[PDB]
Amino acid sequence: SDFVVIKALEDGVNVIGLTRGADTRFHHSEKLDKGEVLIAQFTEHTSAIKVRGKAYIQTRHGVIESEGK
Amino acid sequence: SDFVVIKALEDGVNVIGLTRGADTRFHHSEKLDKGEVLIAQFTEHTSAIKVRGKAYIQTRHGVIESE
Amino acid sequence: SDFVVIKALEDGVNVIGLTRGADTRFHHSEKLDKGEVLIAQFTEHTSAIKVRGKAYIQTRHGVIESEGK
Amino acid sequence: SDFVVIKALEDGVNVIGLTRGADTRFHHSEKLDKGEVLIAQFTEHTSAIKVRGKAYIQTRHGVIESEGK
Amino acid sequence: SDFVVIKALEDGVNVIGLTRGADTRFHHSEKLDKGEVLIAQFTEHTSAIKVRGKAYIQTRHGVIESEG
Amino acid sequence: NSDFVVIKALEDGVNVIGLTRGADTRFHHSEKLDKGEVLIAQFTEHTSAIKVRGKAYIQTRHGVIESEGK
Amino acid sequence: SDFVVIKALEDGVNVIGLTRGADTRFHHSEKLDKGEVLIAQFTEHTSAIKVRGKAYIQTRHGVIESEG
Amino acid sequence: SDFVVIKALEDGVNVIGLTRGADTRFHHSEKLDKGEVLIAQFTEHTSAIKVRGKAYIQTRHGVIESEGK
Amino acid sequence: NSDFVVIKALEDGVNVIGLTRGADTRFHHSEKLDKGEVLIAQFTEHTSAIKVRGKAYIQTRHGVIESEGK
Amino acid sequence: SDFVVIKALEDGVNVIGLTRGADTRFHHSEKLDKGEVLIAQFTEHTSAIKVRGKAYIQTRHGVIESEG
Amino acid sequence: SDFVVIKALEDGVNVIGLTRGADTRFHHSEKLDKGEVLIAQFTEHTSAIKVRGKAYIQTRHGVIESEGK
Numbered sequence: 001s002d003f004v005v006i007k008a009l010e011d012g013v014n015v016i017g018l019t020r021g022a023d024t025r026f027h028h029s030e031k032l033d034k035g036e037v038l039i040a041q042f043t044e045h046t047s048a049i050k051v052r053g054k055a056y057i058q059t060r061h062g063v064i065e066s067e068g069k
Numbered sequence: 070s071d072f073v074v075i076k077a078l079e080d081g082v083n084v085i086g087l088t089r090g091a092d093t094r095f096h097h098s099e100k101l102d103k104g105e106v107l108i109a110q111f112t113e114h115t116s117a118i119k120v121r122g123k124a125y126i127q128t129r130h131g132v133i134e135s136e
Numbered sequence: 137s138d139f140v141v142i143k144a145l146e147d148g149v150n151v152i153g154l155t156r157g158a159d160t161r162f163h164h165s166e167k168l169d170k171g172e173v174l175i176a177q178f179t180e181h182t183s184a185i186k187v188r189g190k191a192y193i194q195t196r197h198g199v200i201e202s203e204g205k
Numbered sequence: 206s207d208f209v210v211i212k213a214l215e216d217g218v219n220v221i222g223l224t225r226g227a228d229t230r231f232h233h234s235e236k237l238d239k240g241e242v243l244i245a246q247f248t249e250h251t252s253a254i255k256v257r258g259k260a261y262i263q264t265r266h267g268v269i270e271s272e273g274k
Numbered sequence: 275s276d277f278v279v280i281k282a283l284e285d286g287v288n289v290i291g292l293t294r295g296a297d298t299r300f301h302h303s304e305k306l307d308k309g310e311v312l313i314a315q316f317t318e319h320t321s322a323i324k325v326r327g328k329a330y331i332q333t334r335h336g337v338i339e340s341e342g
Numbered sequence: 343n344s345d346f347v348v349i350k351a352l353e354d355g356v357n358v359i360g361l362t363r364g365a366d367t368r369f370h371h372s373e374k375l376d377k378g379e380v381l382i383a384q385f386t387e388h389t390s391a392i393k394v395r396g397k398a399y400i401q402t403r404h405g406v407i408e409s410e411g412k
Numbered sequence: 413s414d415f416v417v418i419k420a421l422e423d424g425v426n427v428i429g430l431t432r433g434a435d436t437r438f439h440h441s442e443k444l445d446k447g448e449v450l451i452a453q454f455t456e457h458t459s460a461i462k463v464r465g466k467a468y469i470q471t472r473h474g475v476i477e478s479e480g
Numbered sequence: 481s482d483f484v485v486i487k488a489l490e491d492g493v494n495v496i497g498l499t500r501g502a503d504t505r506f507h508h509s510e511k512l513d514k515g516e517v518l519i520a521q522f523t524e525h526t527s528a529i530k531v532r533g534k535a536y537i538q539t540r541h542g543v544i545e546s547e548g549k
Numbered sequence: 550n551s552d553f554v555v556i557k558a559l560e561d562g563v564n565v566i567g568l569t570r571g572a573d574t575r576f577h578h579s580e581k582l583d584k585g586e587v588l589i590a591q592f593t594e595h596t597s598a599i600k601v602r603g604k605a606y607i608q609t610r611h612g613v614i615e616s617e618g619k
Numbered sequence: 620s621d622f623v624v625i626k627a628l629e630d631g632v633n634v635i636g637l638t639r640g641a642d643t644r645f646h647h648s649e650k651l652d653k654g655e656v657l658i659a660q661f662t663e664h665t666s667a668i669k670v671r672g673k674a675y676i677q678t679r680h681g682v683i684e685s686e687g
Numbered sequence: 688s689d690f691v692v693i694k695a696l697e698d699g700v701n702v703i704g705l706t707r708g709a710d711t712r713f714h715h716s717e718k719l720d721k722g723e724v725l726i727a728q729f730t731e732h733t734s735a736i737k738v739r740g741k742a743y744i745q746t747r748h749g750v751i752e753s754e755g756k
């Protein structure tokens with residue numbers, strides 16, 4: 001299965017997994033502090049991932065950056 | 070399964086999942102505020118995705134932007 | 137399964153799903169307002185997609201544009 | 206399955222599906238008007254597709270154009 | 275499965291399907307008039323395709339032209 | 343979804359010969375092509391080798407090759 | 413399955429595996445000292461990997477660096 | 481399965497099929513006259529192919545030429 | 550099949566350490582390479598992560614990386 | 620399965636098949652004379668191939684030459 | 688299944704197969720004299736290969752050379 005790479009560019013970045021299935025809700029929020037890297041797959045339990053906070057993200061489609069408020 | 074990357078370029082962007090099967094309707098709308106990123110797969114329950122609002126979108130076919 | 141990307145270039149673009157199987161008819165019409173994007177798969181129920189109205193379309197074969205009546 | 210993209214360049218374009226199996230006959234003709242785009246797969250029921258009238262066609266092998274009589 | 279694209283460059287082009295199996299014969303001939311395009315797969319029933327008449331053909335291996 | 347070969351006859355009477363798959367090897371079918379005709383033929387349950395006799399332009403996944411007649 | 417390469421650029425880099433399943437928690441943390449390389453797969457037990465500390469990382473999507 | 485293309489560059493080229501399995505012997509020799517092309521797969525019965533005589537050969541790995549005896 | 554890594558020892562005493570697949574994570578084998586030896590090692594039913602300790606040149610599908618000793 | 624192409628560059632080149640399985644031994648040696656080409660798969664019976672003598676060899680990893 | 692190519696650059700090169708499974712030991716050592724080439728797969732019995740002595744080695748990841756003591 002595909003995965004996403006998230007590098008936090010500020011403290012308190014949240015990487016949130018959304019449930020697979022007929023229902024959609026957040027099942028887990030991993031907090032990353034500045035400079036930490038998370039490499040996360042899609043899985044039986046996770047079919048969408050939301051990133052909140054300033055982060056550098058890599059997927060198979062290229063680079064994208066999230067920006068916080 | 071494939072996925073789409075959606076970065077909101079303004080507040081209040083909606084990423085809407087349409088149901089897989091003989092019946093087509095919206096089943097979830099995820100609200101993204103400015104700068105938030107959602108990476109969302111097609112799934113057993115979602116066979117089309119609609120993006121409403123200003124966003125930068127990446128798919129296997131390249132970049133497209135909603136307005 | 138493959139998917140198509142449709143970005144509406146005017147209001148009232150109509151993305152039409154045609155039934156898979158021995159019979160052929162439309163089963164769903166999804167209307168897009170200008171600037172909305174729909175990313176839609178081929179599925180168990182949909183084996184052909186028709187686009188009516190001005191739109192920018194991406195598929196695995198490249199870019200094509202529909203033009204309205 | 207593979208799919209074809211067909212964009213009508215004049216009114217009255219016919220995209221014709223031919224039956225899969227031991228017998229070969231037309232089972233459906235989708236009429237497209239000028240500027241409409243149809244993205245159609247090969248399927249359990251459709252093993253060959255015929256295009257009549259002026260159209261721009263994309264497949265995995267590239268672009269080809271049909272011309273009307 | 276693979277497919278072939280055939281564009282007829284004159285009237286009366288024939289695209290002929292040969293049967294899959296221990297027996298080999300033509301089972302269908304599709305007539306194309308000038309400008310018409312046929313996109314045809316290999317299938318449970320068709321394991322070879324013959325093109326007769328002037329046509330522009332694309333396959334995965336590139337382009338080829340038949341001549342009447 | 344097996345591989346296939348494209349054969350364009352460059353003279354009349356090109357002979358495309360299918361050989362039997364299996365412990366035994368002989369031809370089971372010969373398809374003659376007139377000049378300018380194109381045959382697109384797969385390997386299959388029954389054909390595991392294809393021989394071309396006569397002048398022809400041939401394409402496969404490995405590129406172009408040309409047969410030359412007797 | 414895919415894998416990640418992590419080279420520690422300082423002492424005490426932590427490579428942490430998060431559990432696959434309905435629940436998400438850390439199940440192992442491997443400590444790397446400066447200059448050690450760990451090549452780690454995603455697995456039945458590990459569906460997310462976190463890197464804490466200064467490291468050079470390669471995945472299929474390219475190079476990224478974590479910072480202490 | 482993979483296949484080889486062999487074009488005979490002189491009369492009497494032999495394309496020899498070696499048996500798959502614990503024993504190894506020649507089960508068939510196909511004689512090619514000058515200019516003939518043989519396109520032959522590896523199969524249930526053939527796991528190695530020997531070419532004797534002058535020939536131009538294409539495989540997935542590129543071109544190679546056999547030389548006369 | 551599974552991916553593999555190539556390791557070339559650039560000094561004596563390089564250790565290539567296999568970590569167990571499964572719920573438990575521990576070292577199960579450590580192969581010691583002397584200078585100039587090469588090891589080409591798969592991921593397997595029993596090994597889901599590999600650690601290299603000591604100066605070595607390493608190739609994987611993602612490219613070259615070099616480990617360094619203390 | 621993958622295959623290798625071997626062209627003999629001198630008489631008496633041997634292409635040797637090593638048995639697949641718990642035991643490793645030579646089960647067949649194919650003698651190639653100068654200019655002959657052998658194209659040989661890995662199989663149920665053969666999991667390694669040794670070339671002895673002067674030969675030009677092609678595999679998916681490119682060209683290599685053995686030397687007498 | 689992947690394979691490696693090993694060409695001996697000196698006499699007495701050893702290509703060693705290490706057992707697959709919970710236990711790890713040498714099950715076979717193939718000696719190569721100068722100029723011999725061995726092309727060897729990973730297999731049910733062999734999950735790691737060690738090369739000792741001066742050799743030129745090709746894998747999917749490119750070229751590497753072992754050096755003798």
Ligand SMILES: N[C@@H](Cc1c[nH]c2ccccc12)C(=O)O
Binds near residue numbers: 087115118
């Ligand atoms: N529960 C939803 C989560 C989801 C995935 N992709 C989506 C796209 C849009 C909205 C929701 C989703 C599903 O598994 O289908």
Ligand SMILES: N[C@@H](Cc1c[nH]c2ccccc12)C(=O)O
Binds near residue numbers: 088089165
């Ligand atoms: N329920 C429809 C949703 C859909 C997917 N792709 C479409 C294309 C057009 C119209 C509807 C759709 C389906 O699963 O088939």
Ligand SMILES: N[C@@H](Cc1c[nH]c2ccccc12)C(=O)O
Binds near residue numbers: 184233234
């Ligand atoms: N019901 C038809 C729809 C279709 C798909 N591709 C086509 C091409 C031409 C005509 C109809 C179609 C089918 O599933 O086969």
Ligand SMILES: N[C@@H](Cc1c[nH]c2ccccc12)C(=O)O
Binds near residue numbers: 228304323
């Ligand atoms: N009924 C035929 C339709 C067809 C597909 N490809 C063809 C090529 C030539 C003639 C007919 C065909 C089949 O399924 O096999």
Ligand SMILES: N[C@@H](Cc1c[nH]c2ccccc12)C(=O)O
Binds near residue numbers: 293295373384386
């Ligand atoms: N009935 C033959 C048709 C065929 C396919 N490819 C060929 C090549 C040569 C001759 C005949 C054929 C078969 O299925 O095998």
Ligand SMILES: N[C@@H](Cc1c[nH]c2ccccc12)C(=O)O
Binds near residue numbers: 361
């Ligand atoms: N009957 C043989 C035909 C064949 C295929 N490839 C070959 C190469 C050499 C000689 C014969 C063949 C087989 O199926 O195996």
Ligand SMILES: N[C@@H](Cc1c[nH]c2ccccc12)C(=O)O
Binds near residue numbers: 434460
């Ligand atoms: N337990 C989660 C771990 C996980 C994987 N990817 C994630 C993305 C975000 C949050 C958690 C996760 C799972 O297997 O699904």
Ligand SMILES: N[C@@H](Cc1c[nH]c2ccccc12)C(=O)O
Binds near residue numbers: 500527635648649664
């Ligand atoms: N009967 C042998 C033929 C063979 C294939 N590849 C080889 C390499 C070397 C020697 C013999 C072979 C086998 O099937 O395994």
Ligand SMILES: N[C@@H](Cc1c[nH]c2ccccc12)C(=O)O
Binds near residue numbers: 427441442453568
């Ligand atoms: N026992 C762990 C080993 C492992 C693989 N990848 C990891 C990443 C981080 C920590 C441990 C691991 C597993 O099989 O999952």
Ligand SMILES: N[C@@H](Cc1c[nH]c2ccccc12)C(=O)O
Binds near residue numbers: 702727730
């Ligand atoms: N019988 C051994 C042969 C072998 C293949 N690759 C090797 C590498 C090294 C030593 C022996 C081998 C096996 O099947 O595993």
Ligand SMILES: N[C@@H](Cc1c[nH]c2ccccc12)C(=O)O
Binds near residue numbers: 579
């Ligand atoms: N017996 C071990 C051999 C092995 C493969 N890759 C390794 C990496 C490191 C240490 C040992 C190994 C196994 O099959 O898993």
